[PDB]
């Protein structure tokens, strides 16, 4: 059913029916990087 | 062969008088630039050494597909116009490896999975070991 | 469009401050103090070496409060820091020479204020 | 690009690439203290045998006139070997086992694409191996 | 602190995909099988930067987090 | 090409390229697709 | 001219060195650049923050945005500075304002001060024979414009106003 509640919810987003036709990031932790051979 | 005026003639290119060419050794070419029949050509060696005369440019015609067969026959004629021509028939056997596709008269096209031995193919009560096993399904 | 006598100092230059050849002199030897520590190090830039000789000869003030008081008496002044570069390194001793070495002082402060305060700078100079 | 043929003796995330095809592709390897004692054999052989390498990004075309002055290998370099077992290729992500003929055996045509980094390899490994889809 | 206290399977592709990359490039060890052991023993010098769809972010480290 | 980049952001809402909210919780309860089964309730069906 | 301001810069660490390693690679890279935005770089006194180390997507280079105070040295249009006599020619004079060189063009050279081949350094002289330019003197020169050459700036010294000449 989760694949039907996304076709039904991208057509009717804008109030009327229409046809058809990496967020995150990384950082280096230097405080852990001081120790460790 | 077409004479035009850049024209070209069948010949044998020496390496350091003709321009761009690969490391396709010119052993198989004869006195005039055609391979005599009965000379085994490998993958990507020169079969007709044609040269657009310019120093001269280079227009070899390689054995495509790198099949390594045998040159079997060479004819030399004129064209419709009066220019010399040549056809060449490079033959190759092809033993049925794994892959080559078979089909009966009753639909159901199939491949060739593995090649077992007479040693391994299941024998009857009388020493018959079938040439081909097709799936039940 | 810009000129340093037309005084177009943008917001990339508005937070700045002029440095004397003596204010640079007290700091590059503090740079070399970090070089004499961790010794036998790969030495400083040759541009620094040319700056090392440029802040060597032209040190117009010597003592630590001498460099500071002339800066601080001119920090009390309302004349610009670029025009001040002249007042303590080029050093006009009169207000007329101050208007002559800086001919962009026109339409500005009085002659006596440009005389009396500069003659206070001339009292505390480290001559040698 | 060649045929796929069935072969039930491969653990599902495996493909059988034959030695006329894996000896053209490359996986550009970057030198560690691990492989620096391993790859020098694969530099020594060249392009004649199968387990060899094409380029040495020090970019020396090590296939003709080997020039043994330039067989140096210190860490940081990039060597482009042909192939081995165990490597990961793309369809999902298979794993190269070598079975010598002319067909791509896989436990049930196709091309074959090979990624070129140890980051986009492990994106395939923990997201898109053949069991994982 | 409105992000999930676990590791999503996309972080683990990009943690171990890059942590094995630096260990390949002569880093201190604390290539692919090297970094699998380090995460499952929780010794990695990487802080995950998770944005939010407003524009903000939240900086998490691995030992603050529950690994798979 | 309809659902080319509809994703799940870290609010666990359902957001896409034009960064608009499609659903507030993914699939009406936030739960994921391939970790559910069919079960029965046994208070709904029986009698009084 | 010396000015001590803020500068924004980022350091590209290779993973051979995985804080104090960054600070000593900082002074190597960008002390002594020829910027048309800020000029020559004299020295770094103060460093604001050792920023967060962002790993780039791919290629392993972490990157440290480090904010820091440094003494700029830019040429500025309209700048009289005492410099040092190094060479005198009828074409011009090649004198260094510390590390930055300078030129004095014929349109600004005095026609009163004629060329002096009598002194062992060539110079300009007077007919009074009392004002003769010797080695390591002080000359006053405006900076009229920056003519950058071989990606390096030499100023344009001018000697056509009050006191512009020899002290």
Swiss-Prot record, chain C:
This is DNA-directed RNA polymerase II subunit RPB4. Component of the RNA polymerase II (Pol II) core complex consisting of 12 subunits: a ten-subunit catalytic core composed of POLR2A/RPB1, POLR2B/RPB2, POLR2C/RPB3, POLR2I/RPB9, POLR2J/RPB11, POLR2E/RPABC1, POLR2F/RPABC2, POLR2H/RPABC3, POLR2K/RPABC4 and POLR2L/RPABC5 and a mobile stalk composed of two subunits POLR2D/RPB4 and POLR2G/RPB7, protruding from the core and functioning primarily in transcription initiation. Part of Pol II(G) complex, in which Pol II core associates with an additional subunit POLR2M; unlike conventional Pol II, Pol II(G) functions as a transcriptional repressor. It comes from Homo sapiens. Keywords: DNA-directed RNA polymerase, Nucleus, Transcription. It is found in: Nucleus. SMART domains: RPOL4c (SM00657). Belongs to the eukaryotic RPB4 RNA polymerase subunit family. GO terms for biological process: transcription by RNA polymerase II; transcription initiation at RNA polymerase II promoter. One of its GO terms (molecular function) is nucleotide binding. One of its GO terms (cellular component) is RNA polymerase II, core complex. It holds the Pfam family RNA_pol_Rpb4. SUPFAM superfamilies: HRDC-like (SSF47819). InterPro entries: HRDC-like_sf (IPR010997), RNA_pol_Rpb4/RPC9_core (IPR006590), Rpb4-like (IPR045222), Rpb4/RPC9 (IPR005574), Rpb4/RPC9_sf (IPR038324). It comes from the Eukaryota. Disulfide bonds: none annotated. Its main location: nucleus. The lineage of its organism: Eukaryota, Metazoa, Chordata, Craniata, Vertebrata.
From Swiss-Prot, chain D:
Changing residue 8 to L: In NEDHIB; uncertain significance; mild. The tandem heptapeptide repeats in the C-terminal domain (CTD) can be highly phosphorylated. The phosphorylation activates Pol II. Phosphorylation occurs mainly at residues 'Ser-2' and 'Ser-5' of the heptapeptide repeat and is mediated, at least, by CDK7 and CDK9. POLR2A associated with DNA is specifically phosphorylated at 'Ser-5' of the CTD by CDK7, promoting transcription initiation by triggering dissociation from DNA. Phosphorylated at 'Ser-2', Ser-5' and 'Ser-7' of the CTD by CDK9 (P-TEFb complex), promoting transcription elongation. Among tandem heptapeptide repeats of the C-terminal domain (CTD) some do not match the Y-S-P-T-S-P-S consensus, the seventh serine residue 'Ser-7' being replaced by a lysine. 'Lys-7' in these non-consensus heptapeptide repeats can be alternatively acetylated, methylated and dimethylated. EP300 is one of the enzyme able to acetylate 'Lys-7'. Acetylation at 'Lys-7' of non-consensus heptapeptide repeats is associated with 'Ser-2' phosphorylation and active transcription. Regulates initiation or early elongation steps of transcription specially for inducible genes. It is found in: Nucleus; Cytoplasm; Chromosome. Belongs to the RNA polymerase beta' chain family. The gene is POLR2A.
UniProtKB/Swiss-Prot annotation, chain E:
It is found in: Nucleus; Nucleus, Nucleolus. Belongs to the archaeal Rpo6/eukaryotic RPB6 RNA polymerase subunit family. This is DNA-directed RNA polymerases I, II, and III subunit RPABC2. DNA-dependent RNA polymerase catalyzes the transcription of DNA into RNA using the four ribonucleoside triphosphates as substrates. Common component of RNA polymerases I, II, and III which synthesize ribosomal RNA precursors, mRNA precursors and many functional non-coding RNAs, and small RNAs, such as 5S rRNA and tRNAs, respectively. Pol II is the central component of the basal RNA polymerase II transcription machinery. Pols are composed of mobile elements that move relative to each other. GO terms for molecular function: DNA binding; DNA-directed RNA polymerase activity. It comes from the Eukaryota. One of its GO terms (cellular component) is nucleus. GO terms for biological process: transcription by RNA polymerase I; transcription by RNA polymerase II; tRNA transcription by RNA polymerase III. Keywords: Acetylation, DNA-directed RNA polymerase, Nucleus, Phosphoprotein, Transcription. The chain holds residues 51 to 126 of 127 of the full protein. The keyword Ion transport does not apply. The gene is POLR2F.
From Swiss-Prot, chain G:
Belongs to the eukaryotic RPB7/RPC8 RNA polymerase subunit family. Changing residue 105 to A: Strongly reduces RNA-binding. Keywords: DNA-directed RNA polymerase, Nucleus, RNA-binding, Transcription. SUPFAM superfamilies: N-terminal, heterodimerisation domain of RBP7 (RpoE), Nucleic acid-binding proteins. The lineage of its organism: Eukaryota, Metazoa, Chordata, Craniata, Vertebrata. Component of the RNA polymerase II (Pol II) core complex consisting of 12 subunits: a ten-subunit catalytic core composed of POLR2A/RPB1, POLR2B/RPB2, POLR2C/RPB3, POLR2I/RPB9, POLR2J/RPB11, POLR2E/RPABC1, POLR2F/RPABC2, POLR2H/RPABC3, POLR2K/RPABC4 and POLR2L/RPABC5 and a mobile stalk composed of two subunits POLR2D/RPB4 and POLR2G/RPB7, protruding from the core and functioning primarily in transcription initiation. Part of Pol II(G) complex, in which Pol II core associates with an additional subunit POLR2M; unlike conventional Pol II, Pol II(G) functions as a transcriptional repressor. It comes from Homo sapiens. One of its GO terms (cellular component) is nucleoplasm. Changing residue 90 to E: Reduces RNA-binding. It is found in: Nucleus. Gene3D superfamilies: Nucleic acid-binding proteins, RNA polymerase Rpb7-like, N-terminal domain. Its main location: nucleus. This is DNA-directed RNA polymerase II subunit RPB7.
